[PDB]
Amino acid sequence: RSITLGNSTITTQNVVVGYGVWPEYLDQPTQPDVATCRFYTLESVQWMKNSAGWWWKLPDALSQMGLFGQNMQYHYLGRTGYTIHVQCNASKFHQGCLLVVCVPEAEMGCSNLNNTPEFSELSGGDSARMFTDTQVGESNAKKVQTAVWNAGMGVGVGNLTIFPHQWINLRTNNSATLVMPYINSVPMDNMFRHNNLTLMIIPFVPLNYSEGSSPYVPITVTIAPMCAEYNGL
Amino acid sequence: GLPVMTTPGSTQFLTSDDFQSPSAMPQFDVTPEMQIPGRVNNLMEIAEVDSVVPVNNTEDNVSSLKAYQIPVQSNSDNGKQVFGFPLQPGANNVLNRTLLGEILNYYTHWSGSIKLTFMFCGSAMATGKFLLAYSPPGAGVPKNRKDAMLGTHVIWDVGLQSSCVLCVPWISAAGYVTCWYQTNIVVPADVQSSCDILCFVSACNDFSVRMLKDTPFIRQDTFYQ
Amino acid sequence: SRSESSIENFLCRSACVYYATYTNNSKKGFAEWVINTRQVAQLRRKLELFTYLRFDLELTFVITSAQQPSTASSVDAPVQTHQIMYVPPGGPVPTKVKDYAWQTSTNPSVFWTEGNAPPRMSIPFISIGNAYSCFYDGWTVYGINTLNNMGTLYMRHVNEAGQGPIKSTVRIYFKPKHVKAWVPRPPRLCQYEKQKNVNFSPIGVTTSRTDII
């Protein structure tokens, strides 16, 4: 409890780790260690009754996150691992169930069958793009098809449990933790033209409450980079 | 020179042979390998992970996330069925599109067992009981709570634990996995009484698959271009 | 019954992936096919269970012929010889049948006459990376990744023909070898629409029924 990293300190109280492997280190590249490893906390989203989902593309959320995000423009290459803490704080009078998946190389699908979605629809900086419970019509030129039962990938949304995941059940559980290694085909990549991870949160059983309780539940995502190293001079 | 003799089946192309072949690009010196996490050696370890089952198809929930949620409400009748689905394979049953059920469609004969995990996604203040009966092949679907009790069953108390596992063989009547109200749902004040139940499926032991074929779920008329 | 579900017993199968015809005298007839597995729907669904693949390649060409109707006067022709040129990724590419890009020394080709065993050839793992990436969330145009580009194949007659037009059709068989697969992935549910991208139209989760009981 009450772990710290640099000048940031969170407190916790089981951890599912990657594919059984731990994040480890690799011209001659050197590493940043003091300037980077701290808990970057994205702002909280509100889980209402008519919610559908959220997703964050992972090396895009920390693009404007300060002294890690200023390292993005000075460096052309690099490899990174992550550790994600997701916690929603409801009472013992609310009910629901979330699924917290982390998808490597999650290509999204456009709404028009001939184009490909524009950059402002794939990911916003530290803002959650949110799923929809309808179809996006084909008259939209460059928009991501956000049918939540296909998860934007053309697949069955129940079979998303093959990735590393954790079920947040409000009856029994309170938070989630995910340790994700560096998964890529090349050892160092372009970091402006590649989002090699995607964190989704999908409410399978929707929120319900009685009249008098709070009409929302906030979900707080905390990302901590591990094994951050770059190719440079 | 040396005397040789050509047998029948010589200048033919059997599409499933294992012969040597001359390399098109020698002297190329390909890229050496790399430790990438998550290597797969067999298809059965993709089958042995959990996956949510759409037990609530019901002709209008299939284009929604409501296909997975089994509804529970505090009724007034003494004993009543919650759900029930057969285990007859192929004939559009609910275990078909899952993560295990689409790997078994690449094979002609298979045999093994099934882990069926349930999860009560309701309030933390609620209390109830359920039956989980399994009718073996030969016995009919039980038409009452009482004769469903006399078979193989697990009494699932919700307030004690929130997950109950029922292992069951599956092979290529054939079975039923019905579930019954034992008691009602007792709830405090200012707590909602309409709860849900999810259901996961997996493979318990190792299966036995033979005679690989092609799946019926994907087809084609024209080339993709 | 234990080894039938392994990776090599799943993917090392031969499959027809392309089929084209070409005439000799037309000055438009010569074949062309870029090597990718995204044309046929039954091979694409097996390779898209995994994110990163790494395999050798092995191709076989079944070439036949036909006698297109000529004018008259005693068509008798000798045997025909075909050329199958492989262009490595980042090489010259022909624009006509008669071109200097056929004769280049770094594009390996096979020659074969009619009436023998079909011309097999094998290509190793040719990529700068360490795995072919079936799914690429990023830009190079969205989701393309020119790093897994396996090359191009071109086919033509080498015999100059005078009395009779002859058209020939070639079927290419495709076989992975020594397959390695990483990072499994759920199987596709919707139908495939295009080749390059992963676009779709939304579909139901399963086949429906009347009641939950």
Epitope: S139 | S63, D221, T222 | S201, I203
Partner: antibody, heavy 117, light 108 residues
Framework: VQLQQSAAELARPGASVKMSCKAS????????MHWVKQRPGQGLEWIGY????????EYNQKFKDKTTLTADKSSSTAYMQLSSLTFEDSAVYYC???????????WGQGTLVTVSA | DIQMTQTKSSLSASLGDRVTISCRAS??????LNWYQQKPDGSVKLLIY???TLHSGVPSRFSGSGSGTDYSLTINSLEQEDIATYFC?????????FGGGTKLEIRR
Amino acid sequence: VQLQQSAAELARPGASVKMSCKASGYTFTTYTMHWVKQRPGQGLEWIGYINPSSRYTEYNQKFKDKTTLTADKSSSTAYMQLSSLTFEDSAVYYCARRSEADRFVYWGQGTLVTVSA
Amino acid sequence: DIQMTQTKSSLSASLGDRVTISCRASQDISNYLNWYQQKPDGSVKLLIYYTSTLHSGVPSRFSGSGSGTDYSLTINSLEQEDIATYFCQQGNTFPFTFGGGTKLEIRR
């Protein structure tokens, strides 16, 4: 493996016509069914489509206020209703099955709708 | 939209010769063209589903070509059964637009 439509009809201007296009030979709730209008003077004109697995329809802007494409899973048919007929609404209507995202592989036989008094 | 212009709308030739029907777009449609054939009794079917590749079951007397805006069809040996009406349709933008018809007729 083929589609079947209804028969040709007749209606007064101001009334409503409803056609059908019954599909058989495949899983009906996989592929989207379209509707194309052929006026005898010009070429074909697109109307819209219906995704049968979700009942989501999307019309061309020239025919948005009138047509209503419905479908039913039981008899595996698909309908189109034309409201507020005018003298320009006399044409031949086809139903297609769009596959591979642009290619209409299977067509119907077409029903002739005329408006008269 | 894209207005496909089949400017002729009436061809005439004998049997055995080479006929070309042309479809001209309004902008670049990037090799996404389809060629359909409507018989006079009403039955419509797809012939060519790109610029230049044939549908399965359609004989090898048909061929297509083109790049950018201008596109073309070719029938090298005209037969009796090929007397029908022809359309072109692009598959690039929304909504789908069809070209005008083109009726063939025997010359003399």
